[PDB]
Design a protein around this ligand. Structure first.
Ligand SMILES: [Ca+2]
Length: 282
């Protein structure tokens, strides 16, 4: 309905009780009035611009005289803002477009809330790829608000970015560490445990004991890669390459390159490392 309702006998109470969550801007107007002529275009174009953020509710004062008298109407035009069932602000007369913003600006949700709401819907539709940029933006804007943090972390997990999700979960304030947080943490914990293999543990010990042995570290990097611990695998190999490009008789570089190939050109971690490798080699 372009978010504009003409009010009559049948929809006054139904929109008065729809103000319970959606802000309603009642617009008392007349086709007779020169104040309305340049308020109406300002008002409608904001209705369509905000798209369901508020309802512009027009009451034709010539057509609906009973309802207008019951509003206490004293001038045309009059606009009143209705929320939680109740009138909360308004004005009589015509006004600049930024005056009307000021009015709207108080009651309308913040950009990060709007983005978080859109992302929540996309998450519901299992569209995590599109939720992610909105959640990144909303999280930043909100100064890393914990509830948005939880959405972002869940979205990162679904996109197989558990390390990034874990970093976001580290930021969640203690008061927000409730059932949803616990569930995400438990998921990350089980993932880390599942990737913490006996074979990796004994290689990690052996590397600790002989940190210069590039062939050992390369073995370990391979087994880390195979359980998805790529940040660790690449960091470990690259450290060896920085010391010696021919490390483990060429094998360190070869394994490093083979891992980057296996991650594919769409992987952001692999892309970082490709660029670092080129600068190192040449
Ligand atoms: Ca260089």
């Amino acid at each position: 309905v372009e978010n504009i309702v003409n009010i009559n006998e049948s929809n006054l109470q139904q929109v008065l009780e729809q103000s319970m969550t959606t802000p309603v801007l009642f617009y008392f107007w007349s086709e007779r009035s020169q104040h309305c002529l340049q308020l109406t275009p300002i008002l409608e174009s904001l209705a369509a611009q905000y798209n369901g953020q508020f309802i512009l509710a027009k009451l034709d004062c010539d057509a609906e005289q009973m309802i207008a008298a019951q509003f206490g109407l004293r001038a045309i035009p009059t606009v009143y803002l209705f929320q939680n069932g109740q009138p909360v602000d308004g004005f009589q007369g015509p006004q600049p477009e930024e005056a009307i913003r000021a009015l709207l600006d108080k009651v309308l949700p913040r950009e990060e809330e709007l983005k978080a709401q859109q992302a929540m819907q996309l998450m519901q539709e299992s569209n995590y790829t599109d939720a992610l940029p909105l959640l990144k933006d909303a999280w930043q804007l909100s100064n890393q608000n914990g509830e948005i943090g939880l959405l972002l972390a869940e979205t990162l997990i679904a996109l197989n970015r558990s390390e990034d999700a874990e970093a976001v979960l580290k930021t969640i304030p203690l008061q927000d560490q409730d059932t949803r947080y616990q569930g995400l943490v438990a998921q990350i914990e089980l993932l880390k445990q599942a990737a913490d293999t006996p074979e990796i543990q004994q290689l990690q010990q052996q590397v600790a004991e002989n940190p210069e042995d590039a062939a050992l570290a390369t073995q370990l990097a391979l087994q880390l890669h195979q359980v998805g611990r790529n940040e660790e695998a690449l960091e470990l190999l690259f450290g060896h390459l920085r010391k010696d490009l021919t490390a483990a008789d060429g094998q360190t570089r070869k394994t490093f390159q083979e891992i980057l190939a296996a991650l594919g050109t769409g992987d952001a971690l692999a892309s970082k490392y490709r660029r670092q490798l080129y600068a190192l080699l040449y």
